């Protein structure tokens, strides 16, 4: 019973990477876990699942290194990951590249965009009406 | 044995009989033509007959109370205060106050 607990941790470190791979899942990632991975998403997103662990949990998933133009690996928010949030991430049971396909309409954006934030190229308010016209000419 | 309320459950009979006989006399001081005396007296006389017939039975306490004698004693305790206030301020005997303005429908 005691020997099986120590051996399970050794198999997890040996599986995902090794010496340099395990450090990436320890320093950058909050929690280290090994399991089945889909590995099909826009940019450098992995999105893993199938792991048991606890109720309402779908593996490590892992954040992307350089999603669009942020070029950050140490710090990344939920700006990453394409249309999959309502799929295998939380709500639906079927995986986005395995069973349930995304619908095409040629209206949705091909490249996924990050959060607006305080950085340039962000959200803005704009006027709509042409207003009451007034003109005077000689 | 003790009641759930703050009022202490004391084993006292005829205590209800004294207070119910006291209030009948107060009603027959000032109002006589008023309906307040004519209606309250027949309820109290109906309740007094149940006390005289049943000797310390829980069924007597269950009649129009059903929360032991302690709750029934509180009904008699404030009855003397209610009768004295009705005797002091004339409302039951006299009716002469002005009518309201004609509006009620919303």
């Amino acid at each position: 019973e005691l020997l099986q607990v120590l051996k399970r941790g050794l198999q997890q470190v040996s599986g995902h990477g090794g010496l340099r791979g395990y450090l990436r899942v320890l320093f950058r990632a909050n929690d280290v876990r090994v399991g089945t991975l889909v590995g099909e998403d826009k940019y450098g997103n992995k999105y893993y699942e199938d792991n048991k662990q606890f109720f309402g949990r779908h593996r490590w998933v892992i954040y992307t290194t350089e999603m669009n133009g942020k070029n950050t690996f140490w710090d990344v928010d939920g700006s990453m990951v394409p249309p999959e949030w309502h799929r295998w991430l939380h709500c639906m049971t079927d995986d986005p590249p395995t069973v349930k396909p995304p619908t095409a309409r040629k209206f949705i954006w091909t490249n996924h965009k990050f959060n607006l934030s305080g950085t340039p190229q962000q959200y803005v308010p704009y006027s709509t009406t042409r207003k009451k016209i007034q003109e005077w000419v000689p | 044995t003790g009641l759930v309320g703050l009022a202490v459950c004391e084993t006292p009979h005829e205590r209800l009989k004294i207070l119910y006989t006291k209030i009948l006399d107060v009603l027959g001081h000032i109002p006589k033509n008023a309906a307040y005396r004519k209606y309250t007296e027949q309820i109290t006389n109906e309740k007094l007959s149940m006390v005289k017939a049943e000797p310390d039975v829980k069924k007597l306490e269950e009649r129009l109370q059903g929360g032991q004698i302690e709750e029934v004693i509180l009904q008699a305790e404030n009855e003397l205060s209610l009768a004295r206030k009705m005797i002091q301020w004339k409302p039951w005997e006299p009716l002469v106050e002005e009518p309201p303005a004609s509006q009620w429908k919303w």
């Binding site: 309402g56 710090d75 928010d77 939920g78 934030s117 305080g118 | -």
Partner: protein, 147 residues
């Protein structure tokens, strides 16, 4: 030259590590702010400590609705705060009066009393969305004092 640029990030890393918020129980939002303590969604000792205290805290979360009675009350709390202070307006009431707004008593915007750095739009501000407010605060701290 190189040491000057790297030392500035080290001071910014100290606030990126831990942020102590004020526990204002002035809302329904405050119950969702108590869900930050609830184990399922946690920033507790990830950065957030629920000790609060009016003076020692670096962050203050303005939870939801503010009335004209609390308008002088919340202002004097802000003065007691240390110089590195960040104000999060968690909830639609805090952003500009989610409900009410046109009402007589409720103060619109919160910025009329206390300036806001991070806005959280949600009425019942889901703990998932509340996790952004602290993570964005940590990301927003980039450069302080060049000269």
């Amino acid at each position: 030259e190189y040491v000057v640029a790297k030392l500035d990030d080290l001071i910014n890393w100290a606030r990126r590590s831990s942020l102590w918020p004020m526990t204002f129980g002035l809302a329904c939002c405050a119950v969702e702010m108590m869900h930050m303590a609830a184990p399922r969604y946690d920033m507790d000792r990830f950065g957030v400590v629920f000790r609060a205290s009016p003076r020692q805290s670096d962050v203050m979360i303005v939870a939801g609705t503010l009335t004209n009675k609390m308008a002088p009350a919340l202002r004097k709390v802000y003065d007691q705060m240390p110089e590195p202070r960040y104000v999060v307006s968690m909830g639609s009431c805090a952003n500009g009066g989610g409900y009410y707004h046109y009402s007589y008593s409720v103060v619109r915007g919160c910025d009329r009393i206390v300036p806001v750095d991070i806005y959280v739009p949600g009425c019942p501000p889901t703990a998932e969305a509340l996790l952004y407010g602290i993570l964005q605060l940590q990301k927003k701290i980039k450069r302080e004092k060049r000269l």
